[PDB]
Amino acid sequence: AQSVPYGISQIKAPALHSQGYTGSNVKVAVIDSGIDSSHPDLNVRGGASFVPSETNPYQDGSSHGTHVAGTIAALNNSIGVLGVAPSASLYAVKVLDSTGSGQYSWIINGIEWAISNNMDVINMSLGGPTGSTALKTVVDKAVSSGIVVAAAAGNEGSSGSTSTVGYPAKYPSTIAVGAVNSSNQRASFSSVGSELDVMAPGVSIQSTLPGGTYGAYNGTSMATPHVAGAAALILSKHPTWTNAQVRDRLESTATYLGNSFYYGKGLINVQAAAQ
Ligand SMILES: [Ca+2]
Ligand SMILES: [Ca+2]
């Protein structure tokens, strides 16, 4: 039996599926710890590793690259879960090792690979309190080149009036994604700040795990792939739209949930975004 995780429904992805749009031909780079390319509920088209200690992008010792991949594009079939964009072309761009850690140089090499391989969408469920000019440059380059880049806002909660949004989410060029629960309340851990753009389900998100299993995780790192996946859905329905159009629709049609410091434009609604 296949389950549809609550988050997939919450963002209204099934509406697109019902229209015959599932992310076909859209190239999504999962810039993370790799993807277990053998998972029965995943199909991985290509990729590359930039982690010195881990040469194979199709093995995932962290679990998170595989989990993120499943939220984006877990296959529509009789098993497991269902991705926001179940027909999307997944690429495993390994820049984090099995500890979920990576150097900015590795991450940068991964973004460079995504650009030179003409990805349509980048998912970066990764963040730190700081970044670097070289990181900003390549991120901005990916976006100016035409790629939709979604990045996790961070799990640093609130701190009075100061931003707790991490990088690369902090860069204006990326879509910074915060986490709500199934009630549309911001999760207590969700980072806040003027850099916040949209929200997506990020509490107990069920997805694929290496080895052919499934499990749930909390975090903005799990909210982000809903937005990456939504971008792919939108592109499959509207192949001629630029990344700027895609982002504008996602933000402009979001469901208002509260003050933007905490919720950005609110919850993505891919049905409205792709209308
Ligand atoms: Ca499935
Ligand atoms: Ca941003």
PDB file of C-alpha atoms and ligand atoms in Angstrom:
ATOM      1  CA  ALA A   1       0.000   0.000   0.000  1.00  0.00           C
ATOM      2  CA  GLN A   2       1.084   3.557  -0.729  1.00  0.00           C
ATOM      3  CA  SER A   3       0.513   6.415   1.714  1.00  0.00           C
ATOM      4  CA  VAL A   4       0.312  10.089   0.861  1.00  0.00           C
ATOM      5  CA  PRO A   5       2.099  11.948   3.661  1.00  0.00           C
ATOM      6  CA  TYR A   6      -0.026  14.794   5.080  1.00  0.00           C
ATOM      7  CA  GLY A   7       2.439  17.392   3.811  1.00  0.00           C
ATOM      8  CA  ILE A   8       1.920  16.453   0.174  1.00  0.00           C
ATOM      9  CA  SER A   9      -1.827  17.060   0.525  1.00  0.00           C
ATOM     10  CA  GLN A  10      -1.377  20.139   2.682  1.00  0.00           C
ATOM     11  CA  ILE A  11       0.453  21.963  -0.132  1.00  0.00           C
ATOM     12  CA  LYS A  12      -2.248  20.805  -2.584  1.00  0.00           C
ATOM     13  CA  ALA A  13       0.072  18.710  -4.778  1.00  0.00           C
ATOM     14  CA  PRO A  14      -2.634  16.139  -5.582  1.00  0.00           C
ATOM     15  CA  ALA A  15      -4.506  18.887  -7.464  1.00  0.00           C
ATOM     16  CA  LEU A  16      -1.654  19.005  -9.981  1.00  0.00           C
ATOM     17  CA  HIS A  17      -1.440  15.222 -10.163  1.00  0.00           C
ATOM     18  CA  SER A  18      -5.153  15.163 -10.974  1.00  0.00           C
ATOM     19  CA  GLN A  19      -4.372  17.492 -13.882  1.00  0.00           C
ATOM     20  CA  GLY A  20      -1.782  15.040 -15.239  1.00  0.00           C
ATOM     21  CA  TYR A  21       1.194  17.020 -13.971  1.00  0.00           C
ATOM     22  CA  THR A  22       3.746  15.203 -11.830  1.00  0.00           C
ATOM     23  CA  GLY A  23       7.067  16.941 -12.612  1.00  0.00           C
ATOM     24  CA  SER A  24       7.913  15.075 -15.819  1.00  0.00           C
ATOM     25  CA  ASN A  25      11.132  16.155 -17.545  1.00  0.00           C
ATOM     26  CA  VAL A  26      11.986  18.610 -14.761  1.00  0.00           C
ATOM     27  CA  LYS A  27      15.539  18.136 -13.458  1.00  0.00           C
ATOM     28  CA  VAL A  28      15.871  18.479  -9.676  1.00  0.00           C
ATOM     29  CA  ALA A  29      19.259  18.419  -7.943  1.00  0.00           C
ATOM     30  CA  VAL A  30      19.208  17.107  -4.406  1.00  0.00           C
ATOM     31  CA  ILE A  31      22.288  18.844  -2.999  1.00  0.00           C
ATOM     32  CA  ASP A  32      22.789  16.772   0.129  1.00  0.00           C
ATOM     33  CA  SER A  33      24.307  13.562   1.519  1.00  0.00           C
ATOM     34  CA  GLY A  34      23.552  11.531  -1.611  1.00  0.00           C
ATOM     35  CA  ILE A  35      20.513   9.476  -2.582  1.00  0.00           C
ATOM     36  CA  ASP A  36      20.076   5.716  -2.198  1.00  0.00           C
ATOM     37  CA  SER A  37      19.446   5.127  -5.896  1.00  0.00           C
ATOM     38  CA  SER A  38      18.306   1.533  -5.288  1.00  0.00           C
ATOM     39  CA  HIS A  39      15.198   2.454  -3.249  1.00  0.00           C
ATOM     40  CA  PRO A  40      12.064   0.870  -4.787  1.00  0.00           C
ATOM     41  CA  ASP A  41      10.225   4.156  -4.231  1.00  0.00           C
ATOM     42  CA  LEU A  42      12.866   6.299  -5.953  1.00  0.00           C
ATOM     43  CA  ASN A  43      14.355   6.673  -9.432  1.00  0.00           C
ATOM     44  CA  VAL A  44      17.644   8.563  -9.751  1.00  0.00           C
ATOM     45  CA  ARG A  45      18.793   9.816 -13.161  1.00  0.00           C
ATOM     46  CA  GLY A  46      22.360  10.925 -12.462  1.00  0.00           C
ATOM     47  CA  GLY A  47      24.475  12.973 -10.086  1.00  0.00           C
ATOM     48  CA  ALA A  48      27.995  13.333  -8.748  1.00  0.00           C
ATOM     49  CA  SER A  49      29.886  13.418  -5.485  1.00  0.00           C
ATOM     50  CA  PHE A  50      32.133  16.210  -4.255  1.00  0.00           C
ATOM     51  CA  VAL A  51      32.789  14.683  -0.844  1.00  0.00           C
ATOM     52  CA  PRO A  52      36.437  13.548  -0.678  1.00  0.00           C
ATOM     53  CA  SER A  53      35.663  10.721   1.763  1.00  0.00           C
ATOM     54  CA  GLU A  54      32.611   9.466  -0.140  1.00  0.00           C
ATOM     55  CA  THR A  55      33.052   8.918  -3.863  1.00  0.00           C
ATOM     56  CA  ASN A  56      29.593   7.450  -4.619  1.00  0.00           C
ATOM     57  CA  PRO A  57      26.669   9.918  -4.836  1.00  0.00           C
ATOM     58  CA  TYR A  58      24.231   6.964  -4.992  1.00  0.00           C
ATOM     59  CA  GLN A  59      24.998   5.785  -1.465  1.00  0.00           C
ATOM     60  CA  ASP A  60      23.669   7.776   1.476  1.00  0.00           C
ATOM     61  CA  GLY A  61      25.131   7.263   4.947  1.00  0.00           C
ATOM     62  CA  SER A  62      23.262  10.189   6.504  1.00  0.00           C
ATOM     63  CA  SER A  63      19.727   9.220   5.363  1.00  0.00           C
ATOM     64  CA  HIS A  64      18.692  12.829   4.748  1.00  0.00           C
ATOM     65  CA  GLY A  65      19.468  13.128   1.053  1.00  0.00           C
ATOM     66  CA  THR A  66      17.316  10.038   0.509  1.00  0.00           C
ATOM     67  CA  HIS A  67      14.561  11.415   2.762  1.00  0.00           C
ATOM     68  CA  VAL A  68      14.545  14.789   0.997  1.00  0.00           C
ATOM     69  CA  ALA A  69      14.512  12.995  -2.376  1.00  0.00           C
ATOM     70  CA  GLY A  70      11.365  11.101  -1.354  1.00  0.00           C
ATOM     71  CA  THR A  71       9.459  14.249  -0.412  1.00  0.00           C
ATOM     72  CA  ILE A  72      10.376  15.704  -3.777  1.00  0.00           C
ATOM     73  CA  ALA A  73       9.711  12.701  -5.972  1.00  0.00           C
ATOM     74  CA  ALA A  74       8.850   9.396  -4.276  1.00  0.00           C
ATOM     75  CA  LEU A  75       7.316   7.324  -7.066  1.00  0.00           C
ATOM     76  CA  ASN A  76       3.566   6.948  -7.561  1.00  0.00           C
ATOM     77  CA  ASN A  77       2.920   3.193  -7.212  1.00  0.00           C
ATOM     78  CA  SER A  78       1.571   0.567  -4.772  1.00  0.00           C
ATOM     79  CA  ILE A  79       4.214   1.120  -2.088  1.00  0.00           C
ATOM     80  CA  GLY A  80       5.788   3.562   0.340  1.00  0.00           C
ATOM     81  CA  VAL A  81       4.998   7.263   0.032  1.00  0.00           C
ATOM     82  CA  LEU A  82       4.311   9.819  -2.702  1.00  0.00           C
ATOM     83  CA  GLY A  83       6.440  12.764  -3.724  1.00  0.00           C
ATOM     84  CA  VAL A  84       5.248  16.255  -4.537  1.00  0.00           C
ATOM     85  CA  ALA A  85       6.580  15.669  -8.055  1.00  0.00           C
ATOM     86  CA  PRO A  86       6.664  11.850  -8.497  1.00  0.00           C
ATOM     87  CA  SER A  87       7.758  11.993 -12.156  1.00  0.00           C
ATOM     88  CA  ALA A  88      10.567  14.535 -11.649  1.00  0.00           C
ATOM     89  CA  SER A  89      14.125  13.724 -12.725  1.00  0.00           C
ATOM     90  CA  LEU A  90      16.199  13.341  -9.539  1.00  0.00           C
ATOM     91  CA  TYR A  91      19.941  14.001  -9.457  1.00  0.00           C
ATOM     92  CA  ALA A  92      22.026  13.005  -6.459  1.00  0.00           C
ATOM     93  CA  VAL A  93      24.471  15.840  -5.893  1.00  0.00           C
ATOM     94  CA  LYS A  94      26.515  14.689  -2.912  1.00  0.00           C
ATOM     95  CA  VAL A  95      28.175  17.542  -0.995  1.00  0.00           C
ATOM     96  CA  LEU A  96      27.554  16.331   2.562  1.00  0.00           C
ATOM     97  CA  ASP A  97      29.092  13.231   4.140  1.00  0.00           C
ATOM     98  CA  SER A  98      27.320  10.651   6.301  1.00  0.00           C
ATOM     99  CA  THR A  99      27.488  13.020   9.299  1.00  0.00           C
ATOM    100  CA  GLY A 100      25.446  15.568   7.349  1.00  0.00           C
ATOM    101  CA  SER A 101      28.483  17.847   7.184  1.00  0.00           C
ATOM    102  CA  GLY A 102      30.322  19.438   4.293  1.00  0.00           C
ATOM    103  CA  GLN A 103      32.792  22.131   3.329  1.00  0.00           C
ATOM    104  CA  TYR A 104      31.541  25.146   1.426  1.00  0.00           C
ATOM    105  CA  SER A 105      34.027  24.218  -1.307  1.00  0.00           C
ATOM    106  CA  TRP A 106      32.252  20.863  -1.743  1.00  0.00           C
ATOM    107  CA  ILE A 107      28.825  22.504  -1.661  1.00  0.00           C
ATOM    108  CA  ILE A 108      30.009  25.076  -4.187  1.00  0.00           C
ATOM    109  CA  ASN A 109      31.290  22.303  -6.473  1.00  0.00           C
ATOM    110  CA  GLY A 110      27.849  20.697  -6.254  1.00  0.00           C
ATOM    111  CA  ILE A 111      26.033  23.907  -7.193  1.00  0.00           C
ATOM    112  CA  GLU A 112      28.515  24.342 -10.063  1.00  0.00           C
ATOM    113  CA  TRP A 113      27.669  20.810 -11.234  1.00  0.00           C
ATOM    114  CA  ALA A 114      23.949  21.615 -11.096  1.00  0.00           C
ATOM    115  CA  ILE A 115      24.532  24.681 -13.272  1.00  0.00           C
ATOM    116  CA  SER A 116      26.762  22.960 -15.853  1.00  0.00           C
ATOM    117  CA  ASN A 117      24.255  20.092 -16.022  1.00  0.00           C
ATOM    118  CA  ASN A 118      21.290  22.423 -16.549  1.00  0.00           C
ATOM    119  CA  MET A 119      19.188  21.539 -13.530  1.00  0.00           C
ATOM    120  CA  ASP A 120      15.839  23.304 -13.266  1.00  0.00           C
ATOM    121  CA  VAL A 121      15.566  23.141  -9.475  1.00  0.00           C
ATOM    122  CA  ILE A 122      18.034  22.934  -6.598  1.00  0.00           C
ATOM    123  CA  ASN A 123      17.106  21.686  -3.158  1.00  0.00           C
ATOM    124  CA  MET A 124      19.440  22.700  -0.337  1.00  0.00           C
ATOM    125  CA  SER A 125      18.228  21.339   2.992  1.00  0.00           C
ATOM    126  CA  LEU A 126      21.377  22.545   4.651  1.00  0.00           C
ATOM    127  CA  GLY A 127      22.414  25.641   6.503  1.00  0.00           C
ATOM    128  CA  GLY A 128      24.791  27.219   8.942  1.00  0.00           C
ATOM    129  CA  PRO A 129      24.822  30.491  10.868  1.00  0.00           C
ATOM    130  CA  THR A 130      27.318  31.898   8.329  1.00  0.00           C
ATOM    131  CA  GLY A 131      28.267  31.599   4.658  1.00  0.00           C
ATOM    132  CA  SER A 132      30.962  32.985   2.358  1.00  0.00           C
ATOM    133  CA  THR A 133      31.289  35.299  -0.630  1.00  0.00           C
ATOM    134  CA  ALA A 134      32.218  32.341  -2.842  1.00  0.00           C
ATOM    135  CA  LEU A 135      29.027  30.601  -1.669  1.00  0.00           C
ATOM    136  CA  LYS A 136      26.917  33.697  -2.355  1.00  0.00           C
ATOM    137  CA  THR A 137      28.468  34.033  -5.803  1.00  0.00           C
ATOM    138  CA  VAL A 138      27.662  30.485  -6.931  1.00  0.00           C
ATOM    139  CA  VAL A 139      24.179  30.542  -5.410  1.00  0.00           C
ATOM    140  CA  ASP A 140      23.412  33.840  -7.142  1.00  0.00           C
ATOM    141  CA  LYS A 141      24.888  32.400 -10.329  1.00  0.00           C
ATOM    142  CA  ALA A 142      22.612  29.355 -10.194  1.00  0.00           C
ATOM    143  CA  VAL A 143      19.550  31.605  -9.832  1.00  0.00           C
ATOM    144  CA  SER A 144      20.619  34.082 -12.507  1.00  0.00           C
ATOM    145  CA  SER A 145      21.280  31.080 -14.767  1.00  0.00           C
ATOM    146  CA  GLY A 146      17.604  30.166 -14.404  1.00  0.00           C
ATOM    147  CA  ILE A 147      17.503  27.635 -11.559  1.00  0.00           C
ATOM    148  CA  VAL A 148      14.894  27.656  -8.773  1.00  0.00           C
ATOM    149  CA  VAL A 149      16.818  27.343  -5.503  1.00  0.00           C
ATOM    150  CA  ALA A 150      15.009  26.373  -2.309  1.00  0.00           C
ATOM    151  CA  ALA A 151      16.928  26.452   0.964  1.00  0.00           C
ATOM    152  CA  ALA A 152      16.013  25.514   4.532  1.00  0.00           C
ATOM    153  CA  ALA A 153      15.503  28.544   6.776  1.00  0.00           C
ATOM    154  CA  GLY A 154      17.084  26.770   9.742  1.00  0.00           C
ATOM    155  CA  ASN A 155      15.951  25.264  13.031  1.00  0.00           C
ATOM    156  CA  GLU A 156      17.163  28.002  15.361  1.00  0.00           C
ATOM    157  CA  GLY A 157      13.726  29.097  16.530  1.00  0.00           C
ATOM    158  CA  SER A 158      13.229  32.727  17.480  1.00  0.00           C
ATOM    159  CA  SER A 159      15.515  35.176  19.258  1.00  0.00           C
ATOM    160  CA  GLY A 160      13.639  38.377  20.015  1.00  0.00           C
ATOM    161  CA  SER A 161      13.818  40.651  16.991  1.00  0.00           C
ATOM    162  CA  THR A 162      16.940  39.165  15.370  1.00  0.00           C
ATOM    163  CA  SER A 163      17.004  36.933  12.285  1.00  0.00           C
ATOM    164  CA  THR A 164      17.862  33.285  12.912  1.00  0.00           C
ATOM    165  CA  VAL A 165      17.712  32.355   9.223  1.00  0.00           C
ATOM    166  CA  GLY A 166      20.817  30.456   8.142  1.00  0.00           C
ATOM    167  CA  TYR A 167      22.784  30.411   4.878  1.00  0.00           C
ATOM    168  CA  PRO A 168      22.264  29.985   1.995  1.00  0.00           C
ATOM    169  CA  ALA A 169      18.641  30.672   2.913  1.00  0.00           C
ATOM    170  CA  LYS A 170      19.678  34.160   4.011  1.00  0.00           C
ATOM    171  CA  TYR A 171      20.701  35.171   0.464  1.00  0.00           C
ATOM    172  CA  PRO A 172      17.862  37.021  -1.294  1.00  0.00           C
ATOM    173  CA  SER A 173      18.322  34.824  -4.387  1.00  0.00           C
ATOM    174  CA  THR A 174      17.146  31.659  -2.657  1.00  0.00           C
ATOM    175  CA  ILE A 175      13.674  30.796  -1.462  1.00  0.00           C
ATOM    176  CA  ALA A 176      14.015  30.488   2.319  1.00  0.00           C
ATOM    177  CA  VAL A 177      11.589  27.882   3.629  1.00  0.00           C
ATOM    178  CA  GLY A 178      10.241  27.671   7.177  1.00  0.00           C
ATOM    179  CA  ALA A 179       8.329  24.819   8.845  1.00  0.00           C
ATOM    180  CA  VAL A 180       4.665  24.511   9.830  1.00  0.00           C
ATOM    181  CA  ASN A 181       2.855  21.538  11.316  1.00  0.00           C
ATOM    182  CA  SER A 182      -0.375  19.999  10.032  1.00  0.00           C
ATOM    183  CA  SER A 183      -2.330  22.734  11.841  1.00  0.00           C
ATOM    184  CA  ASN A 184      -0.512  25.512   9.958  1.00  0.00           C
ATOM    185  CA  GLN A 185       1.204  26.655  13.139  1.00  0.00           C
ATOM    186  CA  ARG A 186       4.887  27.517  12.775  1.00  0.00           C
ATOM    187  CA  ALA A 187       6.969  24.767  14.374  1.00  0.00           C
ATOM    188  CA  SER A 188       8.699  26.031  17.521  1.00  0.00           C
ATOM    189  CA  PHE A 189      12.122  25.268  16.009  1.00  0.00           C
ATOM    190  CA  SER A 190      11.501  27.115  12.728  1.00  0.00           C
ATOM    191  CA  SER A 191      13.989  29.937  12.089  1.00  0.00           C
ATOM    192  CA  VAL A 192      12.588  33.461  11.725  1.00  0.00           C
ATOM    193  CA  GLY A 193      13.605  36.733  10.094  1.00  0.00           C
ATOM    194  CA  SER A 194      12.896  39.126   7.252  1.00  0.00           C
ATOM    195  CA  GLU A 195      14.705  36.694   4.939  1.00  0.00           C
ATOM    196  CA  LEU A 196      11.953  34.101   5.411  1.00  0.00           C
ATOM    197  CA  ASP A 197       9.954  33.605   2.203  1.00  0.00           C
ATOM    198  CA  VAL A 198       7.459  30.736   2.509  1.00  0.00           C
ATOM    199  CA  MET A 199       6.408  27.885   4.804  1.00  0.00           C
ATOM    200  CA  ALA A 200       5.874  24.185   4.175  1.00  0.00           C
ATOM    201  CA  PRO A 201       5.095  21.084   6.284  1.00  0.00           C
ATOM    202  CA  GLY A 202       8.165  20.232   8.341  1.00  0.00           C
ATOM    203  CA  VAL A 203       6.877  18.266  11.313  1.00  0.00           C
ATOM    204  CA  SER A 204       7.100  14.463  11.382  1.00  0.00           C
ATOM    205  CA  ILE A 205       7.518  14.257   7.591  1.00  0.00           C
ATOM    206  CA  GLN A 206       7.324  10.641   6.352  1.00  0.00           C
ATOM    207  CA  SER A 207       9.639   9.812   3.478  1.00  0.00           C
ATOM    208  CA  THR A 208      12.069   7.290   2.016  1.00  0.00           C
ATOM    209  CA  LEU A 209      15.116   6.046   3.946  1.00  0.00           C
ATOM    210  CA  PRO A 210      18.183   4.237   2.629  1.00  0.00           C
ATOM    211  CA  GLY A 211      17.752   0.482   2.364  1.00  0.00           C
ATOM    212  CA  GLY A 212      14.181   0.582   1.089  1.00  0.00           C
ATOM    213  CA  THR A 213      12.410   1.722   4.267  1.00  0.00           C
ATOM    214  CA  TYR A 214      10.460   4.793   5.377  1.00  0.00           C
ATOM    215  CA  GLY A 215      10.465   7.136   8.371  1.00  0.00           C
ATOM    216  CA  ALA A 216       9.698  10.604   9.706  1.00  0.00           C
ATOM    217  CA  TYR A 217      11.839  13.614  10.579  1.00  0.00           C
ATOM    218  CA  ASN A 218      11.246  17.093  11.950  1.00  0.00           C
ATOM    219  CA  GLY A 219      12.905  20.156  10.458  1.00  0.00           C
ATOM    220  CA  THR A 220      12.982  22.958   7.907  1.00  0.00           C
ATOM    221  CA  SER A 221      15.190  20.550   6.008  1.00  0.00           C
ATOM    222  CA  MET A 222      12.015  18.539   5.460  1.00  0.00           C
ATOM    223  CA  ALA A 223       9.878  21.576   4.611  1.00  0.00           C
ATOM    224  CA  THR A 224      12.280  22.655   1.855  1.00  0.00           C
ATOM    225  CA  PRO A 225      11.738  19.651  -0.482  1.00  0.00           C
ATOM    226  CA  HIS A 226       7.996  20.428  -0.564  1.00  0.00           C
ATOM    227  CA  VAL A 227       8.942  23.740  -2.161  1.00  0.00           C
ATOM    228  CA  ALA A 228      11.526  22.174  -4.462  1.00  0.00           C
ATOM    229  CA  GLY A 229       8.884  19.640  -5.492  1.00  0.00           C
ATOM    230  CA  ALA A 230       6.263  22.339  -5.954  1.00  0.00           C
ATOM    231  CA  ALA A 231       8.619  24.221  -8.258  1.00  0.00           C
ATOM    232  CA  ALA A 232       8.968  21.051 -10.362  1.00  0.00           C
ATOM    233  CA  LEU A 233       5.186  20.603 -10.523  1.00  0.00           C
ATOM    234  CA  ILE A 234       4.793  24.197 -11.680  1.00  0.00           C
ATOM    235  CA  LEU A 235       7.522  23.795 -14.324  1.00  0.00           C
ATOM    236  CA  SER A 236       5.925  20.591 -15.671  1.00  0.00           C
ATOM    237  CA  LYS A 237       2.602  22.378 -16.158  1.00  0.00           C
ATOM    238  CA  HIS A 238       4.280  25.580 -17.357  1.00  0.00           C
ATOM    239  CA  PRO A 239       7.524  24.540 -19.093  1.00  0.00           C
ATOM    240  CA  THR A 240       8.061  28.031 -20.557  1.00  0.00           C
ATOM    241  CA  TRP A 241       8.020  29.833 -17.194  1.00  0.00           C
ATOM    242  CA  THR A 242      11.306  31.179 -15.842  1.00  0.00           C
ATOM    243  CA  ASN A 243      12.505  30.577 -12.276  1.00  0.00           C
ATOM    244  CA  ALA A 244      11.469  34.163 -11.514  1.00  0.00           C
ATOM    245  CA  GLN A 245       7.894  33.402 -12.587  1.00  0.00           C
ATOM    246  CA  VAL A 246       7.897  30.186 -10.603  1.00  0.00           C
ATOM    247  CA  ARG A 247       9.119  31.871  -7.427  1.00  0.00           C
ATOM    248  CA  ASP A 248       6.763  34.827  -7.862  1.00  0.00           C
ATOM    249  CA  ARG A 249       3.741  32.520  -8.131  1.00  0.00           C
ATOM    250  CA  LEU A 250       4.794  30.459  -5.114  1.00  0.00           C
ATOM    251  CA  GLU A 251       5.072  33.607  -2.985  1.00  0.00           C
ATOM    252  CA  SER A 252       2.125  35.512  -4.459  1.00  0.00           C
ATOM    253  CA  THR A 253      -0.363  32.654  -4.039  1.00  0.00           C
ATOM    254  CA  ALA A 254       0.796  31.515  -0.598  1.00  0.00           C
ATOM    255  CA  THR A 255      -1.805  31.018   2.118  1.00  0.00           C
ATOM    256  CA  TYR A 256      -1.393  33.863   4.605  1.00  0.00           C
ATOM    257  CA  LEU A 257      -0.653  32.397   8.037  1.00  0.00           C
ATOM    258  CA  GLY A 258       0.528  35.368  10.100  1.00  0.00           C
ATOM    259  CA  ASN A 259       3.251  38.001  10.367  1.00  0.00           C
ATOM    260  CA  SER A 260       5.967  37.631   7.708  1.00  0.00           C
ATOM    261  CA  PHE A 261       8.791  37.723  10.253  1.00  0.00           C
ATOM    262  CA  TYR A 262       7.542  34.298  11.368  1.00  0.00           C
ATOM    263  CA  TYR A 263       5.635  32.932   8.381  1.00  0.00           C
ATOM    264  CA  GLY A 264       6.968  34.771   5.335  1.00  0.00           C
ATOM    265  CA  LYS A 265       4.207  34.852   2.702  1.00  0.00           C
ATOM    266  CA  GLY A 266       2.731  31.820   4.440  1.00  0.00           C
ATOM    267  CA  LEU A 267       2.036  28.257   3.315  1.00  0.00           C
ATOM    268  CA  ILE A 268       2.790  27.346  -0.297  1.00  0.00           C
ATOM    269  CA  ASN A 269      -0.216  26.310  -2.343  1.00  0.00           C
ATOM    270  CA  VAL A 270       0.991  24.723  -5.547  1.00  0.00           C
ATOM    271  CA  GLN A 271      -2.547  24.402  -6.950  1.00  0.00           C
ATOM    272  CA  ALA A 272      -2.974  28.180  -6.775  1.00  0.00           C
ATOM    273  CA  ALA A 273       0.634  28.786  -7.843  1.00  0.00           C
ATOM    274  CA  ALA A 274       0.152  26.732 -11.021  1.00  0.00           C
ATOM    275  CA  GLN A 275      -3.346  28.014 -11.778  1.00  0.00           C
TER     276      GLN A 275
HETATM  277 CA    CA B   1       5.252   5.196  -3.716  1.00  0.00          CA
HETATM  278 CA    CA B   2      16.653  33.367   0.612  1.00  0.00          CA
END
